[PDB]
């Protein structure tokens, strides 16, 4: 699909089961998700943006679908007003930028 | 161009005359630049990213080339770690997300 940019990015992903609104955002380096139960181990992780850096906890090998389009990769789980879906996701759907 | 998102989409502006390098972000509802002298008055604005939020100068109506295309709108400028081309501007440029 094409995506214009006058409104913001938003587009229904499925993680665990649920299905969840999350942002298509190239200025992000890792996907970011609002708290929620992923399965495996975790270890924490500092990130940072605007207003300073905040505490996730890391799981690796998840599974997504994003607009229908499967990937794998890691997701990060803590305190973000937004769902976020980085860069490391958006490669694997095959995402890019064109003007 | 098109551009792929392996790496940050980094790209070489324009403002003031000076060349600076900025990151395409369809994740920014704004631009905002790193601390930087810009002409006319400016307004107060905040703006929330991941770690909480700052506070910006609002400057509107400004020149800005961004890859070649000329694009003339609201630019923020303060404390962001890195210069963002937000939506405002990416949809002048007519950039749009596509997978
Ligand atoms: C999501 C993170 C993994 C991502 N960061 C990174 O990719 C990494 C690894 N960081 C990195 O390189 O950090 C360098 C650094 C160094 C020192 C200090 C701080 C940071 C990121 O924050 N990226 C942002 C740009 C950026 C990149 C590098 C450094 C600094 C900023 C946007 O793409 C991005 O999409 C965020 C996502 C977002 C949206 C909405 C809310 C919160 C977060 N939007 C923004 O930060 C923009 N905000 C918005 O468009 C507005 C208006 N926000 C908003 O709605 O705020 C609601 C809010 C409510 C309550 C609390 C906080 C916000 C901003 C650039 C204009
Ligand atoms: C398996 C998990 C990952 C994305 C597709 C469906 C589900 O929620
Ligand atoms: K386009
Ligand atoms: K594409």
Redesign the pocket.
Known sequence: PQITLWKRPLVTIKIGGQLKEA?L??????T?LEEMNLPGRWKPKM???????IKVRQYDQILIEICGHKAIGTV?VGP???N?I?RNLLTQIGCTLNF
């Open positions: 942002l955002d190239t200025g992000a380096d890792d970011v990130i940072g943006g605007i207003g300073g850096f990060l973000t007003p937004v976020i980085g």
